[PDB]
Amino acid sequence: VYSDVLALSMRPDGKEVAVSTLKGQISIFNIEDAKQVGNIDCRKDIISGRFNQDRFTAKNSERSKFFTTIHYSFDGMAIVAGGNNNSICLYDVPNEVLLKRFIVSRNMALNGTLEFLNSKKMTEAGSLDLIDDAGENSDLEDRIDNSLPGSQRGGDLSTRKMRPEVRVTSVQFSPTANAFAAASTEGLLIYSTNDTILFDPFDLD
Amino acid sequence: VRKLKHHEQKLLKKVDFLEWKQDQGHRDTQVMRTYHIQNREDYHKYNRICGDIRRLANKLSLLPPTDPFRRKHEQLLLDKLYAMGVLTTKSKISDLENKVTVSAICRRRLPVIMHRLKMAETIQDAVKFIEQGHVRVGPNLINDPAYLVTRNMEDYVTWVDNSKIKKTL
């Protein structure tokens, strides 16, 4: 391949392979032969977020426009991929165009959620939120700062000295009902096709 | 403040407003100068751990010499501090109090690393490039200029793709 691959994923037939380069472009490779089958693009249709401490806009941010996990469907005809973005993607394999794009979480305290930041928070020098507000807590323990400066996905939450990035690490399909689950920063999310399990009381007094 | 007189000087024997002993010679700032850290408290974020190295390095020097825990735990300290590259050598034990500076952990900072590799001309231009979002450490583009990068992560810093400054070189 010509660019930096990661997060490999095979078809269950084992004759085609989904690859995620640094460009975001997923490629599909033959295994019985050597050439590339076709490649689907993800650097355009990825919802990425601009952090409050970001100094570049999300349209030309290279934060999260690749995929940290790829999975084939149980026909091998669809693929759900997920990265360090707010966006989870469902590409069709032979028709080669994404079917649906999914938010994992819509949270202001999660960092890369928002596409566009609100300009009322961009003050004279600095963000309005990047000011250390832990020093005004009534409690001593919450006023105590233990944050080592440049910790990225380290041990504890308080020691980033940052908001948590919206990132989704691991992606898998269910065999049966095509349900896909992805363990996010928030936790394990479940999408499914088990529709109308939404419980519906009827004729309530 | 005044180039004060011969008669003023002897009466104001101990006073100063610029260099204090609690202000410890403004030594920290000379490291805040040479490595261009944004906040002041990054220095004391290294120097609060830096004594904590020595505070373990001192009392592991107080154990009996061929205590088989002592030579093992010191090796576990030194391989760790050698993976992060905050000391040049690992053969001697004496770097754990002599080489552990704020400048030594602060020359394992990210723009120092790019400033060594001469992708940037000066230090602050690399900080400006991290702020512009031009750099990445293997997988991830990093926005933060204050990245602690280990010795083994040092090969993973490239320019980020499709940029205007990677095409500049």
Binding site: G126 | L18, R33, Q38
Partner: peptide, 25 residues
């Protein structure tokens, strides 16, 4: 429109003339 690397400008030991070690020249 703020410049990048907004750093804490603080006391220069090699440039501040208020220092008596730099009171000479």
């Amino acid at each position: 429109t703020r410049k990048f690397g907004l750093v804490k400008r603080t006391l220069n030991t090699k440039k501040d003339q208020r220092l008596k070690k730099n009171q000479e020249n």
